[PDB]
Amino acid sequence: MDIDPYKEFGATVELLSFLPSDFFPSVRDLLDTAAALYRDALESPEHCSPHHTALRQAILCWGDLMTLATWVGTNLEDPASRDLVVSYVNTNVGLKFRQLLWFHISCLTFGRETVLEYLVSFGVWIRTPPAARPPNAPILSTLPETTVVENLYFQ
Amino acid sequence: MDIDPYKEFGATVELLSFLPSDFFPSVRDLLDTAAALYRDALESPEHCSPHHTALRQAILCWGDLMTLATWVGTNLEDPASRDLVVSYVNTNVGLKFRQLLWFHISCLTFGRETVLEYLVSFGVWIRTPPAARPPNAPILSVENLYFQ
Amino acid sequence: MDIDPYKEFGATVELLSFLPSDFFPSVRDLLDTAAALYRDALESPEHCSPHHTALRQAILCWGDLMTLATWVGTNLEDPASRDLVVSYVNTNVGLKFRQLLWFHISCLTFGRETVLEYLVSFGVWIRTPPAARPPNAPILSNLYFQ
Amino acid sequence: MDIDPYKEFGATVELLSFLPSDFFPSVRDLLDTAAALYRDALESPEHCSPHHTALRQAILCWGDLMTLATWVGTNLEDPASRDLVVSYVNTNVGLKFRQLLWFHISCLTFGRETVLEYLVSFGVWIRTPPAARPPNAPILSTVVENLYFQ
């Protein structure tokens, strides 16, 4: 079929591609982050959220890709080819999973609407030539639990 | 981490292993069944259900694993060497995704608890030797006052 | 001693021998069924039932002969003597444990009384010559006193 | 699976390992003790108790292991392989069943709680060096109304 993994999350593959290749953390940094922030939730018998379900598959899937590419490597006769298949995976699909794991980790950390707002805010910022570009990049942070109008009300 | 893809859906990796490798359809037949029964829902911009979400990633991820395994196969030069790869795929990640594709498709079709009690029913049926096993495999699927 | 492992469960070794040796599943298929169907019960600190006690040590006891089986392949300089051992484990005591593992798994799955009536019904059915015998084999489908 | 045979009886494999190997009686002395003390119960067609169920399996399963070790004695031509297995059966597996047979026989004779407190008591006692260790080894052992006198 033509399945977009971001469509059920109010985004698209093309929208995620608006962020430059060098913006996303490495795969290991994303995997280490998901474990640090969400290991209890990711291993729990609760759905928790659609982001948890997607992130659970993506972590396992990338593991399967690395498991298969590494096993094929240990069979190649040339030791200089030991990591050749792993390198092909990282160049052919490495960015795809870096987008996917970053999208779900950040959406759980900052909120989906906040993440999508930051996406277009940073994509315009990074494409501004540096002479006109302000030094402070757009900040990605969670919105406050209660609004200012609410706090002044209960005063 | 130690993430069981089936734990959030009320099953385990070990429970799905109870079904033999030759029970599951081919991955090509499994993908065509997900398209036939659920193409519009799987492509919709809606969560629909956690099965839909998981099934969406599995279909895409298998495409990643298939073109990698195919690339390794068509770039090899030895029928022995590429039978090694096919036998590794069929035993490990190929079997893993035939299980996960079957679990979610069937859960969307027959129901999760119907699927699970079928799982244990067929698993002991197929392990009964043929001379004692019934030839029929298990299937996957008022008062008088009421009329007055 | 003279302990019969089935006496406390309402059967005897001779009654279990009424079933032909090829009726029982393989040990691999029996151990996988005990796991898929009763993993959490067999591992819990609960007695559950006398079947669970017998099953627990039956699994561990077979695991002892099958860990003796991987042992005759890492410590034996004679791959012949390696094969003479694993052949005895699987075809001599193997039939014995297939009977024992099948008995307790089936009793927890279908009921001890149901299993015993099936045992007699199938044993007579398998011994009926096939001309007179119906082609379909008979179908197999909490508190304990001291 | 990951089954601990003592878990359902309020103990663990690691706890039984706290007793040194030379503490347990021999298998022969264990079988003779279960026979002298519980032959009729173990042979009866009653469940009796979970300790009886477990002890019945252990006695028979050890019988299978000894039958194999005697069979392997006449049927294995290579002596280096034959005596490697008969030693592996009566030493590595022997210690395994010496704990099992001792645990269930002792629990029937002295009670599960008395057995568990003794196990811990002897483990720290036998690990105390003999110069500081008391010579008495810890012991494993086990109504009238007022109207009668007035």
Add this chain to the structure above:
Amino acid sequence: MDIDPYKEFGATVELLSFLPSDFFPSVRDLLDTAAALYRDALESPEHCSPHHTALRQAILCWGDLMTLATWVGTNLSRDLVVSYVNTNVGLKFRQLLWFHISCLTFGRETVLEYLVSFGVWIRTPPAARPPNAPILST
């Protein structure tokens, strides 16, 4: 026995590994910090806190570990013993010594909040990462 030194203090070995190995100061700078900030408490006959008790053992244990490495490194090329401590026990103790010293200095909740804040910050590539790193208050 599978004991996690951080478990009784509300953390895990896995959570501490989220901080990169180049974030922690050296054991020497960490021991010098514990001396400047807590010598009187650490040498006193009072428990003070479980953090003090754990920190007391860790300081002494590093002494035991370095004396053993010193004796091997001398009484016997042995640049592997220095590369062993630097890459194995050194990182294990830099994490442990930092955890307890920072908890006494800033608070367990504040240290844990900073831990996940810096771990995500340092993993953001510098192009998108803000210039001001998260701080430990002091």
Add this chain to the structure above:
Amino acid sequence: MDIDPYKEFGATVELLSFLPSDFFPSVRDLLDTAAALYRDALESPEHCSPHHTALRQAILCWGDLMTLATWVGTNLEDPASRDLVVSYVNTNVGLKFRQLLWFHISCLTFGRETVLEYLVSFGVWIRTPPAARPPNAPILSTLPETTVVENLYFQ
């Protein structure tokens, strides 16, 4: 710094040296005892007691010491240097940890002043020449809280 690991527990290094070096069990036998008596407490997320905290760190530190000693002893050629690495552990760090492990394990089992009263009682006992020394060593058992006469008086 100059930390005495027994100071916060009402003892000193000098006081623990009063016990002969052959009075203590091996480190293995002491660790075997700690697991058999306190595996649940030592692995629990609760502080329990300062003794639990100290015993916690001592167990892990011995693993660090033995792993470093193993790696050193593994990559040595001459077996005499192998035996020299094991002999260093035996005479130096082993005695210190046999004292520290025994002190905390006993304190959790019998109480601080019971093991301290026993320490001085055995240290004087074993230093008595065997001719005047009673044949049976003093027993390590917790002091009965009160006498039986006072127990019946307050019944």
